[PDB]
Amino acid sequence: SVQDLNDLLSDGSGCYSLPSQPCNEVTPRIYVGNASVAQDIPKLQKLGITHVLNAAEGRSFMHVNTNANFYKDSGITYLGIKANDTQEFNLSAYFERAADFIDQALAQKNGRVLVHCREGYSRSPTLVIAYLMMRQKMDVKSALSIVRQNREIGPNDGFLAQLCQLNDRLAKEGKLKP
């Protein structure tokens, strides 16, 4: 139920806090940030980021206009998904490819990945939550709670519903840890 998920994100009902920081490490070696941290190459290096997954690739004010070329020569590996933060956008079609990209960065003990969007509030947190469910076998409630404790997030109801569908698939087939 999407309303039980919104309840974990708000203070009871109506108000959802906004990110107090431009970037947060939400689980070990996985960072969630915004547009300006994504474009600050010298900060990424300092943090030792090896991979950047841009979940808001595009040419508008609700997107971050970066590409693999922007990161070439800095030795940073790039993956871009042109997603829109709307209840109708099917982000679930990209869950597997995103979960794979994160797994490839973390497979090496030195890897660290930045999954970001415009604000690091709805599009990217959704991909991280999905990854925690699909690869670390956490249920939607536990996965959502862990990220939220580390960063103020608020995925749209359509993204929350896609996560709920995923949770049911995984648990039906006995893939979630209790």
PDB file of C-alpha atoms in Angstrom:
ATOM      1  CA  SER A   1       0.000   0.000   0.000  1.00  0.00           C
ATOM      2  CA  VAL A   2       1.371   3.342  -1.247  1.00  0.00           C
ATOM      3  CA  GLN A   3      -0.199   5.258   1.631  1.00  0.00           C
ATOM      4  CA  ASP A   4       1.724   3.131   4.187  1.00  0.00           C
ATOM      5  CA  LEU A   5       4.880   4.099   2.284  1.00  0.00           C
ATOM      6  CA  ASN A   6       4.047   7.825   2.283  1.00  0.00           C
ATOM      7  CA  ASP A   7       3.398   7.531   5.988  1.00  0.00           C
ATOM      8  CA  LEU A   8       7.047   6.453   6.472  1.00  0.00           C
ATOM      9  CA  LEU A   9       8.176   9.518   4.507  1.00  0.00           C
ATOM     10  CA  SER A  10       6.076  12.238   6.157  1.00  0.00           C
ATOM     11  CA  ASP A  11       5.623  13.376   9.759  1.00  0.00           C
ATOM     12  CA  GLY A  12       2.068  11.954   9.886  1.00  0.00           C
ATOM     13  CA  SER A  13       0.384  13.523   6.851  1.00  0.00           C
ATOM     14  CA  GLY A  14       0.806  16.453   4.382  1.00  0.00           C
ATOM     15  CA  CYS A  15       4.450  17.550   4.818  1.00  0.00           C
ATOM     16  CA  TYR A  16       7.546  15.901   3.318  1.00  0.00           C
ATOM     17  CA  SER A  17      10.930  17.428   4.220  1.00  0.00           C
ATOM     18  CA  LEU A  18      13.369  18.322   1.404  1.00  0.00           C
ATOM     19  CA  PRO A  19      17.064  17.329   1.263  1.00  0.00           C
ATOM     20  CA  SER A  20      19.130  19.174   3.864  1.00  0.00           C
ATOM     21  CA  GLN A  21      22.332  18.365   1.987  1.00  0.00           C
ATOM     22  CA  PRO A  22      23.220  18.089  -1.706  1.00  0.00           C
ATOM     23  CA  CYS A  23      24.577  14.528  -1.363  1.00  0.00           C
ATOM     24  CA  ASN A  24      24.320  11.654   1.172  1.00  0.00           C
ATOM     25  CA  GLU A  25      25.798   8.133   1.347  1.00  0.00           C
ATOM     26  CA  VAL A  26      22.621   6.172   1.925  1.00  0.00           C
ATOM     27  CA  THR A  27      24.164   2.687   2.237  1.00  0.00           C
ATOM     28  CA  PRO A  28      27.939   1.877   2.110  1.00  0.00           C
ATOM     29  CA  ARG A  29      29.582   3.100  -1.136  1.00  0.00           C
ATOM     30  CA  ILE A  30      26.205   4.242  -2.638  1.00  0.00           C
ATOM     31  CA  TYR A  31      25.623   8.005  -2.742  1.00  0.00           C
ATOM     32  CA  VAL A  32      22.411   9.896  -3.643  1.00  0.00           C
ATOM     33  CA  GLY A  33      22.851  13.515  -4.756  1.00  0.00           C
ATOM     34  CA  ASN A  34      21.638  16.384  -6.912  1.00  0.00           C
ATOM     35  CA  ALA A  35      22.522  18.249 -10.164  1.00  0.00           C
ATOM     36  CA  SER A  36      25.369  20.311  -8.833  1.00  0.00           C
ATOM     37  CA  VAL A  37      27.285  17.502  -7.084  1.00  0.00           C
ATOM     38  CA  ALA A  38      27.033  15.532 -10.347  1.00  0.00           C
ATOM     39  CA  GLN A  39      28.674  18.398 -12.241  1.00  0.00           C
ATOM     40  CA  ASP A  40      31.494  19.009  -9.756  1.00  0.00           C
ATOM     41  CA  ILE A  41      34.103  16.570 -11.097  1.00  0.00           C
ATOM     42  CA  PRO A  42      36.775  17.647  -8.618  1.00  0.00           C
ATOM     43  CA  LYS A  43      34.458  16.772  -5.705  1.00  0.00           C
ATOM     44  CA  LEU A  44      33.646  13.367  -7.170  1.00  0.00           C
ATOM     45  CA  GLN A  45      37.335  12.503  -7.379  1.00  0.00           C
ATOM     46  CA  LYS A  46      37.966  13.655  -3.840  1.00  0.00           C
ATOM     47  CA  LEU A  47      35.177  11.291  -2.755  1.00  0.00           C
ATOM     48  CA  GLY A  48      36.634   8.541  -4.961  1.00  0.00           C
ATOM     49  CA  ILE A  49      33.502   8.054  -7.035  1.00  0.00           C
ATOM     50  CA  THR A  50      34.136   5.562  -9.828  1.00  0.00           C
ATOM     51  CA  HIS A  51      30.649   5.435 -11.450  1.00  0.00           C
ATOM     52  CA  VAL A  52      27.906   8.017 -12.020  1.00  0.00           C
ATOM     53  CA  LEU A  53      24.320   6.906 -12.833  1.00  0.00           C
ATOM     54  CA  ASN A  54      22.356  10.007 -14.062  1.00  0.00           C
ATOM     55  CA  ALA A  55      18.625   9.230 -13.662  1.00  0.00           C
ATOM     56  CA  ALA A  56      17.543  12.664 -14.973  1.00  0.00           C
ATOM     57  CA  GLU A  57      19.432  12.910 -18.250  1.00  0.00           C
ATOM     58  CA  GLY A  58      17.949  15.558 -20.546  1.00  0.00           C
ATOM     59  CA  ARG A  59      17.943  19.166 -21.839  1.00  0.00           C
ATOM     60  CA  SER A  60      15.297  20.799 -19.581  1.00  0.00           C
ATOM     61  CA  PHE A  61      15.130  22.519 -16.166  1.00  0.00           C
ATOM     62  CA  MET A  62      13.980  19.202 -14.588  1.00  0.00           C
ATOM     63  CA  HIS A  63      16.933  17.327 -16.053  1.00  0.00           C
ATOM     64  CA  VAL A  64      20.741  17.352 -15.901  1.00  0.00           C
ATOM     65  CA  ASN A  65      22.380  17.733 -19.295  1.00  0.00           C
ATOM     66  CA  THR A  66      25.433  15.505 -18.842  1.00  0.00           C
ATOM     67  CA  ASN A  67      26.739  12.595 -20.985  1.00  0.00           C
ATOM     68  CA  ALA A  68      29.576  10.043 -20.975  1.00  0.00           C
ATOM     69  CA  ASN A  69      31.634  12.693 -22.788  1.00  0.00           C
ATOM     70  CA  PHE A  70      31.350  15.066 -19.811  1.00  0.00           C
ATOM     71  CA  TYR A  71      33.064  12.389 -17.703  1.00  0.00           C
ATOM     72  CA  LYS A  72      35.557  11.114 -20.255  1.00  0.00           C
ATOM     73  CA  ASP A  73      39.209  11.620 -19.258  1.00  0.00           C
ATOM     74  CA  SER A  74      38.331  11.804 -15.555  1.00  0.00           C
ATOM     75  CA  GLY A  75      38.178   7.991 -15.512  1.00  0.00           C
ATOM     76  CA  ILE A  76      34.567   8.022 -14.292  1.00  0.00           C
ATOM     77  CA  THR A  77      32.154   5.443 -15.720  1.00  0.00           C
ATOM     78  CA  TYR A  78      28.746   6.802 -16.846  1.00  0.00           C
ATOM     79  CA  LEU A  79      25.168   5.512 -17.411  1.00  0.00           C
ATOM     80  CA  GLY A  80      22.289   7.885 -18.229  1.00  0.00           C
ATOM     81  CA  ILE A  81      18.531   7.277 -18.096  1.00  0.00           C
ATOM     82  CA  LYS A  82      16.250  10.027 -19.527  1.00  0.00           C
ATOM     83  CA  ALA A  83      13.551   9.820 -16.882  1.00  0.00           C
ATOM     84  CA  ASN A  84      10.774  12.286 -16.071  1.00  0.00           C
ATOM     85  CA  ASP A  85       9.508  12.661 -12.521  1.00  0.00           C
ATOM     86  CA  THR A  86       5.851  11.895 -13.351  1.00  0.00           C
ATOM     87  CA  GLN A  87       3.443   9.220 -12.067  1.00  0.00           C
ATOM     88  CA  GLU A  88       3.119   7.921 -15.659  1.00  0.00           C
ATOM     89  CA  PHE A  89       6.840   7.393 -16.316  1.00  0.00           C
ATOM     90  CA  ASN A  90       7.656   3.668 -16.227  1.00  0.00           C
ATOM     91  CA  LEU A  91      10.927   3.713 -14.262  1.00  0.00           C
ATOM     92  CA  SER A  92      10.440  -0.024 -13.514  1.00  0.00           C
ATOM     93  CA  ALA A  93      11.548  -0.832 -17.070  1.00  0.00           C
ATOM     94  CA  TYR A  94      14.993   0.427 -16.030  1.00  0.00           C
ATOM     95  CA  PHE A  95      15.298  -1.321 -12.638  1.00  0.00           C
ATOM     96  CA  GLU A  96      17.347  -4.298 -13.902  1.00  0.00           C
ATOM     97  CA  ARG A  97      19.791  -2.208 -15.928  1.00  0.00           C
ATOM     98  CA  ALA A  98      20.256   0.174 -13.032  1.00  0.00           C
ATOM     99  CA  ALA A  99      20.697  -2.684 -10.483  1.00  0.00           C
ATOM    100  CA  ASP A 100      23.273  -4.208 -12.848  1.00  0.00           C
ATOM    101  CA  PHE A 101      25.265  -0.943 -13.156  1.00  0.00           C
ATOM    102  CA  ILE A 102      25.413  -0.517  -9.361  1.00  0.00           C
ATOM    103  CA  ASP A 103      26.466  -4.195  -8.926  1.00  0.00           C
ATOM    104  CA  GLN A 104      29.343  -3.699 -11.390  1.00  0.00           C
ATOM    105  CA  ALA A 105      30.682  -0.709  -9.425  1.00  0.00           C
ATOM    106  CA  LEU A 106      30.400  -2.455  -6.086  1.00  0.00           C
ATOM    107  CA  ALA A 107      31.807  -5.794  -7.348  1.00  0.00           C
ATOM    108  CA  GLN A 108      35.274  -4.193  -6.985  1.00  0.00           C
ATOM    109  CA  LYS A 109      36.153  -3.328  -3.367  1.00  0.00           C
ATOM    110  CA  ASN A 110      37.246   0.149  -4.391  1.00  0.00           C
ATOM    111  CA  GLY A 111      34.112   1.102  -6.306  1.00  0.00           C
ATOM    112  CA  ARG A 112      31.761   3.863  -5.175  1.00  0.00           C
ATOM    113  CA  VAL A 113      28.681   4.977  -7.145  1.00  0.00           C
ATOM    114  CA  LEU A 114      26.691   8.284  -7.304  1.00  0.00           C
ATOM    115  CA  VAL A 115      23.098   7.720  -8.386  1.00  0.00           C
ATOM    116  CA  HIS A 116      21.651  11.205  -8.904  1.00  0.00           C
ATOM    117  CA  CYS A 117      18.821  13.180 -10.546  1.00  0.00           C
ATOM    118  CA  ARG A 118      17.910  16.903 -10.391  1.00  0.00           C
ATOM    119  CA  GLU A 119      17.309  17.037  -6.615  1.00  0.00           C
ATOM    120  CA  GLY A 120      18.122  13.482  -5.514  1.00  0.00           C
ATOM    121  CA  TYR A 121      14.530  13.297  -4.198  1.00  0.00           C
ATOM    122  CA  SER A 122      12.316  11.148  -6.396  1.00  0.00           C
ATOM    123  CA  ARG A 123      13.979   9.584  -9.467  1.00  0.00           C
ATOM    124  CA  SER A 124      17.327   8.368  -8.103  1.00  0.00           C
ATOM    125  CA  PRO A 125      16.180   7.219  -4.603  1.00  0.00           C
ATOM    126  CA  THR A 126      13.707   4.933  -6.392  1.00  0.00           C
ATOM    127  CA  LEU A 127      16.497   3.177  -8.313  1.00  0.00           C
ATOM    128  CA  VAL A 128      18.552   2.714  -5.101  1.00  0.00           C
ATOM    129  CA  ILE A 129      15.554   1.315  -3.194  1.00  0.00           C
ATOM    130  CA  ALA A 130      14.895  -1.104  -6.120  1.00  0.00           C
ATOM    131  CA  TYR A 131      18.569  -2.199  -5.975  1.00  0.00           C
ATOM    132  CA  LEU A 132      18.372  -2.900  -2.261  1.00  0.00           C
ATOM    133  CA  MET A 133      15.316  -5.083  -2.864  1.00  0.00           C
ATOM    134  CA  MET A 134      16.612  -6.964  -5.898  1.00  0.00           C
ATOM    135  CA  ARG A 135      20.231  -7.489  -4.775  1.00  0.00           C
ATOM    136  CA  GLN A 136      20.254  -7.283  -0.992  1.00  0.00           C
ATOM    137  CA  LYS A 137      16.908  -8.930  -0.482  1.00  0.00           C
ATOM    138  CA  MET A 138      15.318  -6.238   1.702  1.00  0.00           C
ATOM    139  CA  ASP A 139      11.544  -5.677   1.580  1.00  0.00           C
ATOM    140  CA  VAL A 140      10.176  -2.293   0.332  1.00  0.00           C
ATOM    141  CA  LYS A 141       9.432  -0.976   3.860  1.00  0.00           C
ATOM    142  CA  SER A 142      12.942  -1.791   5.164  1.00  0.00           C
ATOM    143  CA  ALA A 143      14.689  -0.531   2.034  1.00  0.00           C
ATOM    144  CA  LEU A 144      12.697   2.743   2.090  1.00  0.00           C
ATOM    145  CA  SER A 145      13.309   3.295   5.804  1.00  0.00           C
ATOM    146  CA  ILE A 146      17.132   2.879   5.464  1.00  0.00           C
ATOM    147  CA  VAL A 147      17.438   5.460   2.663  1.00  0.00           C
ATOM    148  CA  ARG A 148      15.060   7.916   4.377  1.00  0.00           C
ATOM    149  CA  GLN A 149      17.017   7.766   7.630  1.00  0.00           C
ATOM    150  CA  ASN A 150      20.091   8.980   5.604  1.00  0.00           C
ATOM    151  CA  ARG A 151      18.408  11.478   3.227  1.00  0.00           C
ATOM    152  CA  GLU A 152      15.085  13.272   2.975  1.00  0.00           C
ATOM    153  CA  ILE A 153      13.364  11.592   0.018  1.00  0.00           C
ATOM    154  CA  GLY A 154       9.926  11.570  -1.561  1.00  0.00           C
ATOM    155  CA  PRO A 155       9.367   9.336  -4.585  1.00  0.00           C
ATOM    156  CA  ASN A 156       6.099  10.098  -6.484  1.00  0.00           C
ATOM    157  CA  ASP A 157       3.107   7.735  -5.933  1.00  0.00           C
ATOM    158  CA  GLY A 158       3.568   6.147  -9.342  1.00  0.00           C
ATOM    159  CA  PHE A 159       7.195   5.237  -8.474  1.00  0.00           C
ATOM    160  CA  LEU A 160       6.061   3.931  -5.074  1.00  0.00           C
ATOM    161  CA  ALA A 161       3.414   1.775  -6.746  1.00  0.00           C
ATOM    162  CA  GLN A 162       6.065   0.266  -9.128  1.00  0.00           C
ATOM    163  CA  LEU A 163       8.178  -0.524  -6.067  1.00  0.00           C
ATOM    164  CA  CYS A 164       5.142  -2.199  -4.453  1.00  0.00           C
ATOM    165  CA  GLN A 165       4.581  -4.350  -7.553  1.00  0.00           C
ATOM    166  CA  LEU A 166       8.278  -5.333  -7.430  1.00  0.00           C
ATOM    167  CA  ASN A 167       8.024  -6.178  -3.733  1.00  0.00           C
ATOM    168  CA  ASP A 168       5.137  -8.573  -4.456  1.00  0.00           C
ATOM    169  CA  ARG A 169       7.017 -10.296  -7.322  1.00  0.00           C
ATOM    170  CA  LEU A 170      10.114 -10.874  -5.242  1.00  0.00           C
ATOM    171  CA  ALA A 171       8.248 -12.084  -2.168  1.00  0.00           C
ATOM    172  CA  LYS A 172       5.897 -14.406  -4.093  1.00  0.00           C
ATOM    173  CA  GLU A 173       8.960 -16.135  -5.467  1.00  0.00           C
ATOM    174  CA  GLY A 174      10.612 -16.200  -2.039  1.00  0.00           C
ATOM    175  CA  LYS A 175      13.436 -13.670  -2.554  1.00  0.00           C
ATOM    176  CA  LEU A 176      12.964 -11.248   0.398  1.00  0.00           C
ATOM    177  CA  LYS A 177      14.768 -11.630   3.754  1.00  0.00           C
ATOM    178  CA  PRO A 178      12.637 -11.339   6.972  1.00  0.00           C
TER     179      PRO A 178
END
